[PDB]
Amino acid sequence: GAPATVTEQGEDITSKKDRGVLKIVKRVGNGEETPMIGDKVYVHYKGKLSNGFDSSHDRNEPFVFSLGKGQVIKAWDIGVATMKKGEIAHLLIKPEYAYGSAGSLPKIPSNATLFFEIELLDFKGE
Numbered sequence: 001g002a003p004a005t006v007t008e009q010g011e012d013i014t015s016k017k018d019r020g021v022l023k024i025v026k027r028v029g030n031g032e033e034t035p036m037i038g039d040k041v042y043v044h045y046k047g048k049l050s051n052g053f054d055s056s057h058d059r060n061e062p063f064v065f066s067l068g069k070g071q072v073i074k075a076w077d078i079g080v081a082t083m084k085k086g087e088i089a090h091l092l093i094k095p096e097y098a099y100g101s102a103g104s105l106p107k108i109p110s111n112a113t114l115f116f117e118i119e120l121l122d123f124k125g126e
């Protein structure tokens with residue numbers, strides 16, 4: 001399934017090249033501006049523990065956050081910074097770039113790998 005495909009084919013977008021955040025572009029976006037630290041970012045997403053979703057669509061609204069401000073897991077600050085408006089991307093994320101050994105119960109156990117599909121809807125500078 002889609003997590004395994006990211007394992008096999010995804011790009012390592014970590015600075016350390018530790019395969020902590022792996023990415024596949026599923027639909028190409030437009031623009032050649034990507035988000036930068038500080039921007040207010042609007043996305044839809046579906047996420048799950050890699051072993052099989054929480055979705056923004058379950059709440060009938062986009063998920064909104066400020067990029068690079070630690071309002072989200074590290075993997076999202078790294079990954080969304082690579083995305084163009086209109087892009088749909090898949091991320092597979094090791095615990096070091098998500099919730100680590102502590103986890104975040106009840107939704108996330110210790111040492112969890114996470115999978116997201118993210119659509120970047122829009123972004124605006126602070």
Ligand SMILES: COc1cc2cc(c1OC)OCC[C@H](C)n1cc(nn1)CCCCOC(=O)[C@@H]1CCCCN1C(=O)[C@H]2C1CCCCC1
Pocket residue numbers: 045047048049053054063071072073076104107108114
């Ligand atoms: C660990 O807690 C959660 C994790 C995740 C979703 C969570 C969540 O809270 C309980 O509820 C989403 C809906 C509530 C109303 N909420 C929380 C936040 N914004 N809205 C702020 C959430 C900040 C933490 O989440 C994240 O950084 C990432 C990336 C942004 C979307 C949510 N996300 C998650 O890790 C998801 C998680 C839920 C279980 C399956 C894997 C994805």
